[PDB]
């Protein structure tokens, strides 16, 4: 019943660290806090750290404006 | 093999071959079963859809092509044509389209508008999972349409309302546009007022604005989809449709609930639709055809033919409307948006028979609704709920007169079920039947061979396994919206023609379902129709069409129902085992509630209205009325062993009153005392229980000072203002004829007066009403309320003055009713009292001393 835009807004209020899977790319999964998003669901992530699946390390990416089209799977971690 | 058989059927715009391929899918078949009050345009609207679908009808002449005389396609009967009404259901199978060009096939059924035919309307509701209630503007929302809304809500059937005869308010009334929109606000206001759980309007695709005589049906979404889809982008067009209807205004791109100081208040239905419509009419009858032709070539993209330009004003207007409002895809769209298969169909089929779990997919299970004569041959109108039905298959059939017996037989769980072969299958096309190899789920079809097994309504099934026979649920007998109390005794004038007449009556019981035919042992036949005109159609159809015989016909009579007034003063043992049964009238609301487990029952009874936990706890049963048990000796399980038998003898006791041997109504029987002898033999025990039960209940009423109950036609009348007093005078001409509320119909001179007239007093009361009103009034007699009132006067009156050839005084009435009913049933043989019911002698002396 909860619409996905207001659900993403709920993750925005909760601020919990968010794991995002990208589109047609299984190698990298980005982690970090959601500081905001737009109506296009382009999300600016805070404390972004890569998570290569190819034992999981990462390089801290800082804050990011991430285009919603590549955004596939939004979760918390 | 049947290719040479047809040759008659008219070629249809869509091919008929694809329609059955569409019929193979249960999702694509919606049954409309259009409904509405008398002369609402039903048969004419169905005619619009038939002419719409087919190419060229062979039975339409040039005159009905111009539209002077409205073509009624779906009534092929001689009487239906001459008498001008509809009688028997004849629908159509029409592949139709929405605003989306998606084509859903539809089975239409036109139920007659006159109320005495409401039996066919009940068959239409049970048949159709959707309902189009066709409402006249000037008649407003009548009480009949109210009964159709409440009735369709009762059996859980979707409703899509068609407001009809706009061209009447526009021409006859000549309503100013704003005032006419106020009229529509009044119609829809009452509509949503009587519909509890739904909101109907032009938005949401429910209300359908139509005029059948001039042949156009449109919905605001269809209309905007036509002529506003050019200017409006696809983005805002949907919301724009949703906001059209009311409490909004427009100037330029601006919307306010207030007129915002503009010179004109046109609440966006007036201005955007209703005003263009009015200008279409006024210009059509008025404006010069050259510049009008220029408008149609400009605005609506309409090109008029020279032959069209040369038409008379009315046919030309009809033609212009058929060009502006194109072939009707809007009404079908409203049909689709109205009906949702889930949340309904399962609820429906659960309401018609029993709540249960789905249906076995293998077995074929179909309701047999109505037996129709069509080409002069016996047919059967059958709706397939599950499974596929093949031509030449052997199928089981059960008249719904035996249903609950079989269901109890399964609750205690070869076959007694008579089987018949399907000779042919057809899809009703109106004037033609289109034969089809096989019938599928969720559609309405005709079958020749079924008609012999069942009296009126049946269940039709073929199982592939016995566990299905365990899992089959059977349809309850059809509940006819109105009970038929109108009574006429028939005899053939030549008694030697009696046997053939018998066959005729059988056919009648099949062809007219709501007729209740009773065969009296005195040889005088009895027929119960809903009302005057329905029984008349019965007679003309019976004599001319089926069995041609000179038939003597008694004056119209009624069914009386015996009852009790006060409480039985004495509890009388009854022997040939001595039972004394006390009687008492039902509560007022208890009756109305009754006409329309044990812990829930006692809670509903007691809770809802006054009872004692012992009484409400000990209620044994209810029928048609309620048998109760209140001794202190209930302790033995004996009364539980014989309880079923007591309910049986109670059935035979209630089916025949002590006075006229007529159904007992509104009477509660509480058992005060039941004696059992020392020795017990179950055969003589029970077989001596039944007569003591019947005699017991008779003594029950007679000690209660019984009263007769006459039925009451509820009367709906439409008159004008100046002619109102005359009608009232008529109401003083009859013993009955109470007037209750005089309803002003908005924007029309017609005052619709409600009333109640007893069926004895009302004979041709419609006709006398019309002659007295010089055709400006209209009367309708509708008894579905099953309301009974006491005829004034006391039964068991030794001295009452009854004029032989003249009507009797008021206070003596019930006495002559009892006498004359007893004689017509030959009960008199010459005040029943208690003597034949064994007050005995010494005890009879004692009651005479009191």
């Amino acid at each position: 019943m909860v619409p996905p835009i207001n659900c993403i807004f709920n993750f925005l209020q909760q601020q919990t660290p968010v794991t995002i899977w990208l589109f047609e790319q299984i190698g990298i999964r980005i982690k970090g806090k959601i500081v905001g998003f737009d109506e296009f669901m382009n999300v600016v992530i805070d404390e972004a750290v890569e998570i290569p699946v190819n034992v999981e390390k990462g390089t801290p990416l800082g804050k990011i404006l991430l285009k919603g089209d590549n955004i596939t799977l939004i979760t918390s971690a | 093999i049947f290719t040479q058989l047809k040759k008659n059927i008219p070629k249809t715009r869509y091919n008929r071959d694809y329609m059955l391929s569409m019929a193979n899918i249960p999702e694509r078949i919606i049954n409309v079963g259009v409904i509405g009050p008398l002369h609402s345009g039903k048969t004419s609207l169905m005619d619009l859809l038939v002419i719409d679908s087919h190419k060229r009808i062979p039975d339409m002449s040039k005159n009905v092509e111009l539209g002077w005389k409205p073509l009624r396609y779906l009534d092929n009967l001689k009487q239906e044509i001459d008498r001008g009404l509809s009688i028997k259901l004849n629908g159509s199978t029409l592949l139709c389209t929405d605003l989306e060009s998606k084509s859903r096939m539809i089975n239409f059924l036109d139920a007659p508008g006159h109320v005495n035919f409401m039996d066919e309307t009940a068959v239409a509701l049970a048949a159709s999972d959707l309902v189009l209630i066709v409402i006249d503007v000037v008649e407003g929302v009548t009480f009949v349409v109210e009964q159709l809304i409440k009735q369709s809500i009762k059996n859980n059937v979707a409703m899509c309302f068609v407001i009809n005869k706009l061209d009447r308010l526009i021409l006859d009334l000549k309503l100013p546009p704003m005032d006419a929109y106020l009229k529509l606000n009044h119609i829809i206001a009452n509509i949503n007022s009587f519909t509890k759980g739904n909101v109907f309007s032009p938005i949401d695709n429910n209300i359908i604005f139509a005029s059948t005589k001039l042949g156009f049906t449109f919905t605001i979404k269809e209309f905007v989809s036509y002529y506003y889809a050019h200017s409006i982008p696809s983005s805002k067009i949907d919301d724009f449709t949703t906001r059209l209807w009311g409490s909004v205004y427009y100037h330029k791109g601006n919307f306010r609930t207030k007129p915002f100081e503009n010179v004109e208040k046109y609440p966006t239905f007036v201005e955007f639709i209703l005003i263009p419509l009015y200008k279409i009419f006024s210009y059509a009858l008025s404006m010069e055809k050259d510049k009008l032709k220029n408008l149609l070539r400009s605005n609506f993209r309409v090109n008029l033919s020279q032959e069209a330009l040369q038409y008379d004003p009315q046919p030309f207007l009809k033609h212009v409307l058929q060009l502006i409002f194109r072939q009707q895809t809007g009404l079908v769209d409203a049909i689709t948006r109205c009906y949702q298969p889930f949340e309904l169909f399962d609820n429906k089929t659960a309401h018609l028979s029993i709540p249960g779990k789905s249906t076995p997919e293998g077995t074929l299970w179909a309701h047999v609704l109505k037996t129709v004569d069509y080409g002069g041959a016996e047919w059967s109108l059958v709706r397939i709920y599950s499974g596929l039905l093949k031509r030449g298959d052997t199928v089981r059939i059960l008249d719904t007169s035996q249903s609950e017996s079989r269901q109890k037989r399964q609750l205690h769980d070869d076959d007694e079920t008579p089987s018949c072969e399907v000779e042919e299958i057809g899809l009703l096309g109106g004037r033609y039947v289109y034969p089809v190899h096989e019938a599928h789920k969720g559609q309405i079809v005709l079958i020749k061979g079924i008609s012999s097994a069942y009296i009126k309504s049946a269940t039709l099934y073929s199982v592939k396994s016995k566990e299905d026979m365990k899992q089959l649920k059977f349809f309850k007998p059809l509940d006819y919206i109105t009970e038929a109390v109108f009574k006429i005794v028939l005899q053939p004038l030549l008694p030697r023609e009696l046997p053939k007449l018998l066959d005729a009556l059988n056919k009648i019981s099949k062809y007219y379902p709501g007729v209740i035919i009773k065969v009296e042992e005195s040889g005088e036949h009895v027929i119960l129709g809903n009302g005057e005109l329905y029984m008349d159609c019965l007679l003309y159809d019976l004599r001319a069409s089926y069995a041609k015989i000179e038939i003597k016909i008694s004056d119209p009579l009624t069914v009386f129902s015996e009852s009790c007034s006060n409480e039985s003063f004495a509890s009388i043992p009854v022997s040939n085992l001595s039972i004394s049964v006390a009687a008492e009238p039902m509560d007022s609301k208890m009756i109305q509630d009754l006409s329309r487990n044990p812990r829930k029952l006692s809670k509903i009874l007691r809770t809802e209205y006054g009872w004692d936990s012992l009484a409400s706890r000990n209620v044994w049963s209810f029928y048609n009325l309620i048998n109760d048990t209140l001794p202190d000796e209930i302790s033995p399980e004996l009364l539980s062993k014989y309880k079923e038998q007591i309910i049986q003898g109670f059935y035979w006791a209630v089916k025949e009153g002590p006075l006229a041997e007529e159904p007992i109504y509104g009477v509660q029987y509480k058992l005060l005392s039941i004696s059992v002898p020392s020795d017990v033999n179950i055969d003589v025990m029970k077989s001596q229980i039944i007569p003591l039960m019947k005699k017991a209940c008779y003594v029950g009423l007679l000690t209660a000072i019984p009263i007769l109950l006459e039925p009451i036609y509820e009367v709906d009348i439409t008159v004008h203002a100046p002619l109102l007093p005359i009608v009232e005078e008529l109401m003083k001409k009859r013993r009955g004829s109470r007037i209750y509320k005089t309803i002003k119909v908005a924007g029309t001179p017609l005052l619709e007066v409600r009333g109640q007239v007893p069926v004895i007093e009302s004979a041709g009361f419609e006709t006398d009403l019309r002659l007295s009103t010089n055709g400006l009034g209209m009367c309708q007699l509708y008894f579905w309320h099953k309301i009974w009132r006491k005829v004034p006067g006391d039964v068991l009156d030794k001295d009452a003055f009854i004029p032989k050839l003249k009507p009797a005084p008021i206070n003596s009435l019930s006495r002559d009713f009892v006498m004359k009913t007893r004689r017509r049933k030959g009960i008199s043989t010459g005040g029943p009292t208690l003597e034949k019911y064994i007050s005995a002698e010494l005890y009879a002396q004692l009651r005479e001393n009191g």
Binding site: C7, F23, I74, S76 | -
Partner: protein, 71 residues
């Protein structure tokens, strides 16, 4: 046009998504963009196990990534 998922509401549905991805979760929300809100987000890893990624923290997945969904 709002897609009608109403018959999938509060039901366990198995999405398949671009990149040979397979999700299983109970439907919660949706929209005209068809983006889905799932509860009890369950990844199907390459072979044997099925990773339960989200329990009460649910999830949202963009629409166009969806190959399909089964009930």
């Amino acid at each position: 046009s709002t897609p009608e998922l109403k018959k999938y509401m509060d039901k366990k549905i198995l999405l398949n998504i671009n990149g040979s991805r397979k999700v299983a979760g109970i439907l919660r929300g949706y929209d005209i963009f068809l983006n889905v809100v799932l509860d009890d987000a369950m990844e199907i890893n390459g072979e044997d196990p099925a990773n339960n990624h989200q329990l009460g923290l649910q999830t949202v997945i963009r629409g166009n990534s969806i190959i399909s969904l089964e009930a």
